[PDB]
Amino acid sequence: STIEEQAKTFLDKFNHEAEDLFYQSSLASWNYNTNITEENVQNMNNAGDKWSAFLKEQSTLAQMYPLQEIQNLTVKLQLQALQQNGSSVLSEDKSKRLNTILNTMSTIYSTGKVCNPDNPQECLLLEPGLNEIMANSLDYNERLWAWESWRSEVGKQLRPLYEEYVVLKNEMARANHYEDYGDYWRGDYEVNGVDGYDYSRGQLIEDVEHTFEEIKPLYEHLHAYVRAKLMNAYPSYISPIGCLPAHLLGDMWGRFWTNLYSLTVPFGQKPNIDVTDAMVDQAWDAQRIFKEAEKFFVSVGLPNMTQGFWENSMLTDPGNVQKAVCHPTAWDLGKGDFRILMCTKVTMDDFLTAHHEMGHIQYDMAYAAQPFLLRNGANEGFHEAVGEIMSLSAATPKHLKSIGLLSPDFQEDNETEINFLLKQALTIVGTLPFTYMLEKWRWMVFKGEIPKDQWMKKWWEMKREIVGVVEPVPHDETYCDPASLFHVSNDYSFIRYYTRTLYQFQFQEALCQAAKHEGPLHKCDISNSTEAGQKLFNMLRLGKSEPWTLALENVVGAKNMNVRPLLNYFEPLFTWLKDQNKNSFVGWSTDWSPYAD
Amino acid sequence: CPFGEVFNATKFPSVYAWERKKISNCVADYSVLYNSTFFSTFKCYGVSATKLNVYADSFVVKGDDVRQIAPGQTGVIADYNYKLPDDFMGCVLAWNTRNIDATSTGNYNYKYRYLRHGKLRPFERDISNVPFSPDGKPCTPPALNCYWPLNDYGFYTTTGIGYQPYRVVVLSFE
């Protein structure tokens, strides 16, 4: 029959052979994360490798079914996925040595320590201790040291490897019929051959930048405001018209401005919406947390969790003797086995996380009907978007009343609302230029637009001009600060962090509207609306089966990305910022420096 | 009468190689099963009364595969392993057997067919294990486009209910 009808059969053998082979890996991996052990570690590897070897084998096998000969969208997709040559397309040792680079980079990052320039016996690792300085300390110099040490002791180490990294990667990328490794990454957003819902690898760059422009006014003002507060905490270190010193930004790179909340709280006399000590008050436990999120979804017409979810999950740290990795992750194992691994503590933050992770599970349960290879978020940004959307609703002063955590008689004045929005803006709005700029540098570096000898020159040009942030110490090409960030030195597309942010709001504004919600968009909770349920679930059940443009269009009403909902959420922060900025300066100069003096 | 021999049996077959037990004359009352929340399906396609007085088909399938033991019905299991006639019928019973037919570790005893040049006629059986080629060719695996038509179900204790093992017993009337 048609090589199509053939390829269908190939895929049908694959799906069964993989569904199983994955489940096995899955399960070993599971055994390990809950029970770290020599026996349990070794096992995780064995199953994991029969796996990647099965993938390699089936990849080389699908490589024999010619894509330019299929007229079924669905199977073309599955094949496309399978027949990615990847790192195989290189020479025996080119691929070998590349993996050598990628490996030590990952290591010297995770292993890298730094010691006091006066006390050589106290040596700090990035986690914790060092990022703890960078998140708490208000001592200008102490911070400057921590900022510089990282970028000097480890940046300079990563420089030569990142140098060779870009070469071999761009080689692989071009050999796969892409323009550069960057183009290879935007490929995730690509959709060809579906009239109307298509999207080209370039249509991203322009879309991102176009959307990013509309952020400026919001961002600029956030900037101006925090710029000003910061001056008060670091007297005489900051120019009321220049950029922000990179090392004063509350995390190590300045990706998030979360921790500057201490320093920038609008109305710091007003207290905190925090029910942690009132969950303990009604002697709540793990199961109550999850049973409650479970309610939250059953409330919008999604299903309960599986019996095997409640049977097979792990919602609490099981004390000592048996030690388990606590990172809140939600597991989609295969064979309708869904579960969560979370070291739940009776706390608001853990309560919210529980909603967020259980939101991943739901999406998983949704696209499960789908054939194996189509079981994923529409694009790299959909899953987490959905994750956050559940935190967003579950945190509103409204939800907390009904759930009997926040006291009925509590009122919500327009000042608490501003505090909360600013808390958000620090995290959500802070990181958007950071992310965009970060990725722009890479993209260009991959496009061959930034010469080796100006790598740190354009990096900091762009930080000053886009992000509005100045290096406290000048860096020559001896450093490699862009790669001092986990994602960059550990080979990771970073723009997903930008686009996920943008969707989550488009999803909410849509969901909230359909839930018939009255007030400001940030007070919205979708609880109890089966209507909001249906619309969400409508995209949710697709997985990768349709193009991310349709999946979007299934909930939002458009084929493309849109920054307006994200703005609409921060409207009453924006207006309020403009006032605070009344007698402040909005925008910055790229010429001022905290050292050139 | 010999029902305890049938669906009380220690050993149940694969779907593709299903078993048929010939029951004649023996006096039954049905109450042996009628009153029990031991079963999970028990949907009949003919009647459901009791007149004191027949074929019994036994095999094991996946949760999500029970749907397919009925007139009409979709694929794989209904298409290549066990087809039930559009008309003519009796009763279909099922029960979850995770406890017996699953090892936490994996039980790949049970198989089923996923490939055949041609759908089955009802009550037909295929026990043939020939490497399959979609162009009716001879086949010498692991050559490309060669496939063994039998797939191991793989019953882990922990999977979703739709993926746990169910014993099935079809009662036909003659």
Ligand SMILES: *[C@@H]1O[C@H](CO)[C@@H](O[C@@H]2O[C@H](CO)[C@@H](O[C@@H]3O[C@H](CO)[C@@H](O)[C@H](O)[C@@H]3O)[C@H](O)[C@H]2NC(C)=O)[C@H](O)[C@H]1NC(C)=O
């Ligand atoms: C493109 O490829 C896929 C191949 O999977 C096609 O979808 C599949 O094709 C058949 C249509 O003959 C579907 O069978 C139908 O199943 C439902 C199940 O309830 C039944 O009601 C129908 O009467 C029929 O038997 C099958 O479900 C579907 N497979 C999957 C994976 O869902 C698709 O048709 C191809 N495009 C075309 C139109 O050429």
Ligand SMILES: *[C@@H]1O[C@H](CO)[C@@H](O)[C@H](O)[C@H]1NC(C)=O
């Ligand atoms: C955890 O560790 C024990 C060793 O004391 C081991 O026997 C057991 O298999 C492990 N449990 C799990 C989760 O597999």
Ligand SMILES: *[C@@H]1O[C@H](CO)[C@@H](O)[C@H](O)[C@H]1NC(C)=O
């Ligand atoms: C939905 O929420 C309200 C309060 O928010 C609660 O009283 C109501 O009973 C809930 N119903 C369901 C089915 O979730």
Ligand SMILES: *[C@@H]1O[C@H](CO)[C@@H](O)[C@H](O)[C@H]1NC(C)=O
């Ligand atoms: C959700 O789970 C509990 C399990 O005891 C049950 O009482 C409730 O009816 C379930 N809701 C649904 C979707 O049936």
Ligand SMILES: *[C@@H]1O[C@H](CO)[C@@H](O)[C@H](O)[C@H]1NC(C)=O
């Ligand atoms: C098996 O048969 C005996 C009667 O001899 C009965 O007590 C029991 O309920 C039967 N079990 C099943 C699985 O039907």
Ligand SMILES: [Cl-]
């Ligand atoms: Cl940096």
Ligand SMILES: [Zn+2]
């Ligand atoms: Zn998440």
